[PDB]
Amino acid sequence: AEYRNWSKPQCNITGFAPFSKDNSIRLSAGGDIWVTREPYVSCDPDKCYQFALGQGTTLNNGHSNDTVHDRTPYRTLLMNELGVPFHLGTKQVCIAWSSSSCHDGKAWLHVCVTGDDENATASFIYNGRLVDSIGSWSKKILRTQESECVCINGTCTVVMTDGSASGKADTKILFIEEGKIVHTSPLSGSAQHVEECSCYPRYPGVRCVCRDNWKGSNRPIVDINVKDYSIVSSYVCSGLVGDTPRKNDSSSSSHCLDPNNEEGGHGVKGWAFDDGNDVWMGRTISEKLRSGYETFKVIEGWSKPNSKLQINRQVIVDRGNRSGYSGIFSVEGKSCINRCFYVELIRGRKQETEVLWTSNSIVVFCGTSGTYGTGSWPDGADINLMPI
Amino acid sequence: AEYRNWSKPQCNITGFAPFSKDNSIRLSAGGDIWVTREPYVSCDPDKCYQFALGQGTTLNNGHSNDTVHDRTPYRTLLMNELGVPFHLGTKQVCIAWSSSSCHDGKAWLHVCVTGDDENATASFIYNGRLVDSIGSWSKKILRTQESECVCINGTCTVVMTDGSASGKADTKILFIEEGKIVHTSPLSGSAQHVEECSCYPRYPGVRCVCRDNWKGSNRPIVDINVKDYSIVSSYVCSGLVGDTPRKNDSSSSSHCLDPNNEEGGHGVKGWAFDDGNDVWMGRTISEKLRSGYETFKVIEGWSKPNSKLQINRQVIVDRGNRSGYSGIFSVEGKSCINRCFYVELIRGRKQETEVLWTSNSIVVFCGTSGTYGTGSWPDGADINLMPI
Amino acid sequence: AEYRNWSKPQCNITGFAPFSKDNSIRLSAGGDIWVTREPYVSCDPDKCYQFALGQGTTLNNGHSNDTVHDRTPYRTLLMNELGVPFHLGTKQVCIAWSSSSCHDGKAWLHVCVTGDDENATASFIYNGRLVDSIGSWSKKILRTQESECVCINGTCTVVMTDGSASGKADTKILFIEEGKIVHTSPLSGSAQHVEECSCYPRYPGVRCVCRDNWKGSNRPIVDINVKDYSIVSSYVCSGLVGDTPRKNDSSSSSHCLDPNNEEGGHGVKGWAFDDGNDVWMGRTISEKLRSGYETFKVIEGWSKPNSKLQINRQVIVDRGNRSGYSGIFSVEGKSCINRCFYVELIRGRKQETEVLWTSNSIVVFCGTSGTYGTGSWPDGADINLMPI
Amino acid sequence: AEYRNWSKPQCNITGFAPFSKDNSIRLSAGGDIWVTREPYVSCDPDKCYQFALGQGTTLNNGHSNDTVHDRTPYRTLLMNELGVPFHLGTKQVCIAWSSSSCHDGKAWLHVCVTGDDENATASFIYNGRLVDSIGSWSKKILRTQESECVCINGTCTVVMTDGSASGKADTKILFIEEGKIVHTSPLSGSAQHVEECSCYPRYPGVRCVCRDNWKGSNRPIVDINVKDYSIVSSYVCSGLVGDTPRKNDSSSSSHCLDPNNEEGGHGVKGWAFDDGNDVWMGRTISEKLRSGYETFKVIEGWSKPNSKLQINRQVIVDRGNRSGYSGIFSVEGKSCINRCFYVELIRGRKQETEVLWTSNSIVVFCGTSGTYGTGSWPDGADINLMPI
Ligand SMILES: *[C@@H]1O[C@H](CO)[C@@H](O[C@@H]2O[C@H](CO)[C@@H](O[C@@H]3O[C@H](CO[C@H]4O[C@H](CO)[C@@H](O)[C@H](O[C@H]5O[C@H](CO)[C@@H](O)[C@H](O)[C@@H]5O)[C@@H]4O)[C@@H](O)[C@H](O[C@H]4O[C@H](CO)[C@@H](O)[C@H](O)[C@@H]4O[C@H]4O[C@H](CO)[C@@H](O)[C@H](O)[C@@H]4O)[C@@H]3O)[C@H](O)[C@H]2NC(C)=O)[C@H](O)[C@H]1NC(C)=O
Ligand SMILES: *[C@@H]1O[C@H](CO)[C@@H](O[C@@H]2O[C@H](CO)[C@@H](O[C@@H]3O[C@H](CO[C@H]4O[C@H](CO)[C@@H](O)[C@H](O[C@H]5O[C@H](CO)[C@@H](O)[C@H](O)[C@@H]5O)[C@@H]4O)[C@@H](O)[C@H](O[C@H]4O[C@H](CO)[C@@H](O)[C@H](O)[C@@H]4O[C@H]4O[C@H](CO)[C@@H](O)[C@H](O)[C@@H]4O)[C@@H]3O)[C@H](O)[C@H]2NC(C)=O)[C@H](O)[C@H]1NC(C)=O
Ligand SMILES: *[C@@H]1O[C@H](CO)[C@@H](O[C@@H]2O[C@H](CO)[C@@H](O[C@@H]3O[C@H](CO[C@H]4O[C@H](CO)[C@@H](O)[C@H](O[C@H]5O[C@H](CO)[C@@H](O)[C@H](O)[C@@H]5O)[C@@H]4O)[C@@H](O)[C@H](O[C@H]4O[C@H](CO)[C@@H](O)[C@H](O)[C@@H]4O[C@H]4O[C@H](CO)[C@@H](O)[C@H](O)[C@@H]4O)[C@@H]3O)[C@H](O)[C@H]2NC(C)=O)[C@H](O)[C@H]1NC(C)=O
Ligand SMILES: *[C@@H]1O[C@H](CO)[C@@H](O[C@@H]2O[C@H](CO)[C@@H](O[C@@H]3O[C@H](CO[C@H]4O[C@H](CO)[C@@H](O)[C@H](O[C@H]5O[C@H](CO)[C@@H](O)[C@H](O)[C@@H]5O)[C@@H]4O)[C@@H](O)[C@H](O[C@H]4O[C@H](CO)[C@@H](O)[C@H](O)[C@@H]4O[C@H]4O[C@H](CO)[C@@H](O)[C@H](O)[C@@H]4O)[C@@H]3O)[C@H](O)[C@H]2NC(C)=O)[C@H](O)[C@H]1NC(C)=O
Ligand SMILES: *[C@@H]1O[C@H](CO)[C@@H](O[C@@H]2O[C@H](CO)[C@@H](O)[C@H](O)[C@@H]2O)[C@H](O)[C@H]1NC(C)=O
Ligand SMILES: *[C@@H]1O[C@H](CO)[C@@H](O[C@@H]2O[C@H](CO)[C@@H](O)[C@H](O)[C@@H]2O)[C@H](O)[C@H]1NC(C)=O
Ligand SMILES: *[C@@H]1O[C@H](CO)[C@@H](O[C@@H]2O[C@H](CO)[C@@H](O)[C@H](O)[C@@H]2O)[C@H](O)[C@H]1NC(C)=O
Ligand SMILES: *[C@@H]1O[C@H](CO)[C@@H](O[C@@H]2O[C@H](CO)[C@@H](O)[C@H](O)[C@@H]2O)[C@H](O)[C@H]1NC(C)=O
Ligand SMILES: [Ca+2]
Ligand SMILES: [Ca+2]
Ligand SMILES: [Ca+2]
Ligand SMILES: [Ca+2]
């Protein structure tokens, strides 16, 4: 095995094609299936895996009551091959209420954060063993991407935040070689608040599109140089903005440099990626709620401030159905690197009160250079058929 | 690993011997087992796998109600080693309400169709990654074989249809190398309607026996040249015809060129293969319903129009028990290529109303050059012991 | 990989030590576990597997009612690593109501008999594919060992019977190379009725100890030459006889040549093996019922007619608990070939009427050259805690 | 593969970071999960496995009643990858009510003790086969570590005891090469009673920290030379003592040579390891009960009699929650050998009478040279939501 360098060009993208769906909530009504949230996908050089943060319980289980909360000592990172729902044979890779994972071409890295909110521990596990750890630097919920990290030539990078979710916080970018932290760089640039970054290789470095939970409904961008550890940051130029909540399409804006101060408080994890001067992006269809999911290309939406010229829209989840977090992962083909994304389909409390639990399923799409049609691929469980 | 060429001769066939059975409906009454339909079998160079289209639910689950329908956004292609019933650890390989899979000697190809009836997407997944996609060309339920595709020297071929199920439709043959579509040829020849082809390697090309849903109770044949992409087609010569519904044995006929216009509307997926001038074929024992299953050789039934001289009959499922789709797969031996087949054993609605679900189990037989006896290997579940 | 030749000497044996137990009936009261009977063990060069004939159902399942019967079209051969109980992820290797399996050093052979009692089919599956088949030669329940076959230099041998279970029958020894039957020899010698042979490599050939269901409570021996296909047979010399039913120890006898005509009708599968002039053997502790299980060495019990001088007794299952079939398997060590055995622990009907099903668990011991103590390792389920 | 020698230095330790948690009791309320006790962890050169002694039953099962007892013929050693809870697909490696396992770099050794209390058998299984056995030498519950053994250059060592749990007993150290016992040495030195040793490689030999069940609340140390088979022993010097029960911190003492005679009767399995003149150790937070779990370093606590100067305390399980046995395992990194530990989190009877069963989950931490925060990671099941 050799280290990945991701040195091939990005594949041509005309949109996205269906790749995977796990139906886990429908299965949970007739099977012992983990309660999860914050899923993601990452692939080793041969095959893809799904990940999520368990809640230390199956769904048809009294312990699924009041699983809406994000952080408990029972959450662990689950990992199975993609399309295998999280069943009782699934491996719990580490103790985690926040995580990121990625394969460097030779082995898996996992970054797993657990413990007290004011004094958490992040463990760094590589090739099946603990190699490093850090404690919280700001004593305010050390936390990370909830999607794949990215490794180039054996140096893996991951973005972490510690501090307020509604004010200035302290974000840092770690550089990790065979599980050992070799450098830590502070965030720099124009991004004012960065959470839950969705990162991808853009040789020779790494590019991330994140969540501003404070003043922006436009998404931050963080670029990472893995050779000299420098960082720059700004916001996606597109005037069709990617966060939820957000204003309507006519009222929304971005001009690349600053948070837009438009319904900027709160947010949802999401993604975007550049294609020349254009941007491909996903977002919820609702502007207020995590309902529906659409993708499209904004023409000149990477380079031109406030462009709203979209094309190539696809509905992934219709507006009548629940969505959730979403994130990017990248897959090496014969001659190019493709971009794919997952959508978390959240079910249960607080929004659906017929049940006491909160969980999710996933759906997953990959870039295509071919053609495609239309559809909608929601979670599909009937809340009234579920165990309470 | 090397590409398969399937260049060995067909094995000698004196009939068929038992190979596998999964008992999945009996197990579903005391276990969490997927609801399926449209199963098939395909082998990599070492071992065989069973496949089927899940319904996004287990059987003992409220979501198994009204699983008679063919297309939903929750159907996914399931894949396990042959003889492992579809349990909660089974991988959902792709999103699909129509599919075909095959191994080229180096990796698996999956062709997976999902989305809206009038604007579906087919994804082409090879070696664990999405490589290509197409949209519907006729806006009328793009669909494929529901059994294994066939690859020679790294070029895999698969037959797809789009258009009416009871009128002229548009069938195309795709040629796919490492997941990338390199050519598409239209159907040509005397076959007038082609669905759900059962294809096999017949070096140097591929031969298929299919379902005419419009005017024939005789089965179409499609031959595919993988070098120059040419296509020819006609109908199985045997006057003992392979579709259901069909007329009785004295009234039925075929003369090789045209659909017989004998109870030709509707049909069932099935198979046949040539053995010199003779044909080996399966069919339901009932002429009207998907009940029982028999195989036999028709002497000169490949070459002589309307031959009805059978020999070497075997009952696979007695006339009192349900059958379903059936299809061929091929397995390389030391010196010859063998032909095998599966039978889908459908249980539940609409025919059996004691339950609300529709599902299936499988039984599987392989060609033999040896000897054998008699038996009957039906699904075996007692409908009155099942969850509703 | 190379073919096994089993050319090392037999290990020194001072008795037997515990090796495995699956607890499957206790687990069946809180888990979805197959209903089985006729288990056995066989090892590839690295690790051991347990096998059994399923009944097409789990235990907590309405289909477990009236699973006392030996032959149905739903029975399949199950195979898992040894110590993994038969759960819903277990592979059903073939359709079988009688079977034998063995690994030749390169791949697995399975011999699987199914179909009608008067016209069964045996399939021969090697390296994952069907290679050969035969039909019944006497039209009276073609059947085989229910324990491992044995392969030397790529030639595997298996003993099969067809004909009366209470009169002269037709036994044959098949010689199978990479799944293909290359020769069939009739039984020859002084054994008058041979069923369910427990065979082991005794380089340069194979030795079997079997069940006489007609006139002997002493067990037949069949010796097989794999080079020239010749066969000889007789009966274990020990006057402590191995079958059940049998007379008491003072009344029982054997003089090596003939069935003893002592409670000879009926029987149970079992085993013995030679150690110089001595014999190591197992048997039920009860003389009438399949209750308890003991092993011991009879001094000069291989060579001296009617020797009853035992030593080195061990209780494996106390007399108060149920046993069942038992059989031998052999395991290659660094410098010697060891002998091991399993015991089927049968629970349920007809003897235990609190439940409607019949099933079993297993316990497994291996020869030792070391020391050991005493114990009893019965099934352990409480019949009153079981699903009906 | 090569034999492990463990010749690298011990890693620098600043404390411990979270590594794994299985949540098995919470899962048992909605899933078929084994009833266990006496767990441990051991790693092959690539990945870690969890082990425990099953009780021959799942938890939601009538057979889980009265599983408080330590020894039955149904207990077997379970083994899965670390973080996979013990589910129905888990392999039962051997019959055992006491065990130890370890990987020599090429294959696994298991030491498995079962049978009658007064005449037990220990089986020695290596690379999947039984290689050796011994019987009890003192006829009083032959027993072993309940945590990993240690192998250097192909010689594995394991500590065993036979005799009184409250008086002088006979402890022996066995040296085992590819499963064969090559030497047995008696305990020698100042340790007066030794049970349940937690051993680790300390090149060129092995060091163990154990449980004195008779007169010490300070833990014994046993050092083993694997070249010449010599043994020495004494007690951990730290005046902060590691057993439970124990006196309070001001009253407790140790002076390295003798059991302290301070609440010395009874005990719990636990661990400690040297770091220069300092000692890292775990213990329950309660002095009387198996409640809470803490680690810390005692400065000069390896070399200076009765040192009580602690630093670097961490709570692993808060004082309000149950703990249990604990033990060490060692993991090879790129340049150093790390020390890790597990804690058994016992639930059920006798202490918790709402249920009839006794079982456990695990939590696992590894040494770090980095930084970390605070937390508490208890079992987390609600006893009132459990099956009885
Ligand atoms: C079968 O499946 C296929 C594949 O999924 C579907 O095709 C997709 O259809 C969607 C929806 O129409 C297309 O996305 C939309 O693209 C619009 C921009 O393209 C049009 O305008 C440009 C500029 O004039 C033209 O160049 C284009 O022409 C070319 O493409 C068409 C096919 O679309 C060919 O027919 C032509 O020959 C040309 O080659 C197009 O005419 C874009 O405006 C649109 O976004 C608006 O609409 C969506 C709802 O659809 C809103 O959510 C969104 O907010 C936008 O609305 C704002 O903007 C409009 C316009 O200014 C205002 O009117 C609104 O008020 C609001 O301000 C969306 O992105 C997609 O490109 C196309 N894919 C491909 C590969 O062709 C088939 O439709 C489907 N068939 C069925 C029956 O299911
Ligand atoms: C144990 O298992 C074995 C293996 O499964 C069974 O053997 C199989 O038996 C079936 C059923 O008999 C055989 O298939 C049938 O083959 C018929 C053609 O062969 C006969 O005719 C030709 C031409 O005269 C002869 O050459 C043959 O002779 C040779 O073979 C036999 C053994 O069969 C030997 O004994 C001889 O020495 C020769 O070597 C045969 O005599 C074929 O007609 C038949 O199909 C009709 O019948 C089936 C029902 O069985 C109908 O479904 C079907 O529609 C056909 O009926 C139409 O045609 C007939 C005849 O014209 C009309 O009368 C009807 O009205 C209707 O128009 C079927 O294909 C099979 O070949 C054979 N397998 C082998 C390898 O031998 C054993 O029977 C079984 N024993 C038991 C007790 O279970
Ligand atoms: C801890 O575990 C160990 C290991 O499992 C147990 O040791 C085993 O114990 C059994 C039962 O005693 C032994 O098997 C029996 O062997 C009897 C033959 O050996 C004795 O006689 C010969 C000939 O005189 C002597 O050479 C032997 O002496 C040597 O061995 C002993 C140890 O046993 C040493 O102490 C000596 O120093 C010598 O080295 C023995 O004295 C054999 O007769 C016996 O079979 C009869 O009894 C069983 C019930 O146990 C019946 O089921 C069976 O039918 C036989 O009974 C018939 O025969 C007798 C005698 O003629 C008649 O009296 C009866 O009426 C009837 O006709 C059995 O095979 C086994 O060898 C031994 N294993 C080893 C390795 O030592 C320990 O006992 C156990 N301790 C506890 C407390 O649990
Ligand atoms: C976020 O997480 C981190 C990491 O887990 C937490 O930091 C850990 O905190 C614990 C608890 O304080 C530390 O362990 C304790 O260490 C005590 C010894 O160190 C102090 O004394 C020595 C000698 O004077 C000084 O050198 C030290 O100074 C250095 O370290 C501190 C940080 O701790 C820096 O701030 C300094 O600049 C220096 O670099 C320390 O001052 C040790 O006494 C203590 O053990 C007593 O207390 C525990 C309860 O905490 C009792 O269970 C135990 O029995 C001991 O109590 C006996 O002894 C004391 C003192 O004699 C008596 O008063 C008692 O009555 C009784 O006799 C414990 O081992 C740990 O070292 C530290 N880890 C690291 C890496 O820093 C943060 O606190 C946490 N923050 C939050 C808010 O959650
Ligand atoms: C769902 O989980 C809730 C949060 O844990 C449980 O509420 C707790 O209940 C106890 C008892 O009233 C309180 O002491 C504690 O303050 C907390 O609110 C709740 O009981 C549990 N069950 C249901 C059905 O809601
Ligand atoms: C089985 O599934 C049916 C098809 O989904 C359910 O019918 C639906 O029921 C709702 C309520 O009456 C309708 O609004 C909808 O039109 C559709 O017919 C059916 O309820 C469900 N259950 C049963 C027991 O049949
Ligand atoms: C257990 O299985 C029996 C054997 O299949 C069932 O008996 C059958 O029952 C039907 C109905 O009376 C008969 O027509 C048939 O002859 C056969 O005896 C039996 O019902 C089933 N259940 C129980 C509880 O015994
Ligand atoms: C839990 O398991 C106990 C120990 O096995 C059972 O007690 C046994 O019960 C039988 C019947 O009274 C006695 O003969 C035997 O002496 C022993 O005490 C107990 O019944 C079982 N169930 C419960 C609910 O405790
Ligand atoms: Ca925001
Ligand atoms: Ca038709
Ligand atoms: Ca007999
Ligand atoms: Ca003590």
Author numbering:
A (entry chain A), B (entry chain A), C (entry chain A), D (entry chain A): 82 to 469
Report text from the authors:
Influenza A virus has two surface glycoproteins, hemagglutinin (HA) and neuraminidase (NA), that act as the major antigens. NA is a type II transmembrane protein that forms a homotetramer. The natural function of NA is to cleave the sialic acids from cellular receptors to facilitate virus release and from newly synthesized HA to prevent virion aggregation. Neuraminidase (NA) of human influenza H3N2 virus has evolved rapidly and been accumulating mutations for more than half-century.
